[PDB]
Design a protein around this ligand. Structure first.
Ligand SMILES: O[C@@H]1[C@@H](O)[C@H](O[C@@H]2CNC[C@H](O)[C@H]2O)OC[C@H]1O
Length: 301
């Protein structure tokens, strides 16, 4: 096949991107993204601050611009993200303990209701682990409310929209030997022991010199799949966009039956949150990079 999404679809997978509403008046962006991808994640517009800027008062305008663009252009949507320490609106930053717990639940319920039956995967919880050797939970108001915050988010989400696959998403969890990876593994293990309704694990896959790709990513994906969850590569970008690594990652997903697909975290290098690292598949001018060709070729076998 001649495009990433269609090539992924040959094996029942998707190839997605992050879409930013502020870029939707750029004709190069909309036409290349339209052509190439069959899955969309809103880069910002479905986060907590964007969707509930005051408690109880939702704003789906920008989120719906992204969602509607996606469906108009024949893409499914990953919802990103319902419960997270980052990008919280001030009113939520001020809450702790039981008040925060209620607000967390209410936020999940309100956003998921708006999209009920329309979102194939939700990143229900994002970035709950600390970096480094400890495997500890990250410090946040959410984590201070109790170790159960994550499981409660998942139980809430399952009741709100039984149709959605519920994902836990994180970064620096791709290398099987890292403590962070093992922390996430053991959480998912525990969740399965206790009936917590997690369906998927999202590997952000922000690869760079400090957190480099390792061939053992395939082992990580296999081992999580074996816990009884799907796996997804959710925010792929690679410092310098080497073709070799991009092919390796693609082939890792293709080798794991429950790997749903790959989302790259933007369209052109100039659209990247890390544009200085030129880490995506398209040049600033919209032309295809060597890494594009390597990914397409891998998807095509
Ligand atoms: O626009 C950026 C956006 O790309 C960034 O996205 C996060 C990258 N780190 C992992 C998270 O899960 C993503 O949402 O968020 C900050 C924005 O300024």
């Amino acid at each position: 096949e001649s495009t990433l999404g269609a090539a992924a679809a040959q094996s029942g997978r998707y190839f997605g991107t992050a879409i930013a509403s502020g870029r939707l008046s750029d004709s190069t962006y909309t036409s290349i993204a339209g052509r190439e991808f069959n899955m969309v994640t809103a880069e910002n517009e479905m986060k907590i601050d964007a969707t509930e800027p005051q408690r109880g008062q939702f704003n789906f305008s920008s989120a719906d611009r992204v969602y509607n663009w996606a469906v108009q252009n024949g893409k499914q949507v990953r919802g990103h993200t319902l419960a997270w320490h980052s990008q919280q609106p001030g009113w939520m930053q001020s809450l702790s303990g039981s008040a925060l717990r209620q607000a967390m639940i209410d936020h999940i319920n309100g956003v998921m209701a708006h999209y009920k039956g329309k979102i194939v995967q939700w990143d229900v919880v994002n970035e709950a682990f600390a970096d480094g050797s400890s495997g500890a939970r990250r410090d946040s108001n959410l984590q201070r409310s109790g170790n159960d915050w994550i499981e409660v988010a998942f139980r809430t989400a399952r009741a709100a929209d039984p149709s959605a696959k519920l994902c836990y998403n994180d970064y620096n969890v791709e290398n099987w030997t890292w403590a962070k990876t093992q922390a996430m593994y053991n959480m998912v293990r525990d969740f399965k022991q206790r009936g917590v309704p997690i369906d998927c694990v999202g590997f952000q896959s922000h690869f760079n010199s400090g957190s480099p790709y390792n061939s053992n990513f395939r082992t990580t994906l296999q081992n999580f799949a074996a816990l009884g969850v799907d796996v997804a590569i959710t925010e792929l970008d690679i410092q310098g966009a080497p073709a070799s690594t991009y092919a390796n990652v693609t082939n890792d997903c293709l080798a794991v039956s429950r790997c749903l697909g790959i989302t790259v975290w933007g369209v052109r290098d100039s659209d990247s949150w890390r544009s200085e690292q030129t880490p995506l598949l398209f040049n600033n001018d919209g032309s295809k990079k060597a890494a594009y060709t390597a990914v397409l070729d891998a998807l095509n076998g």
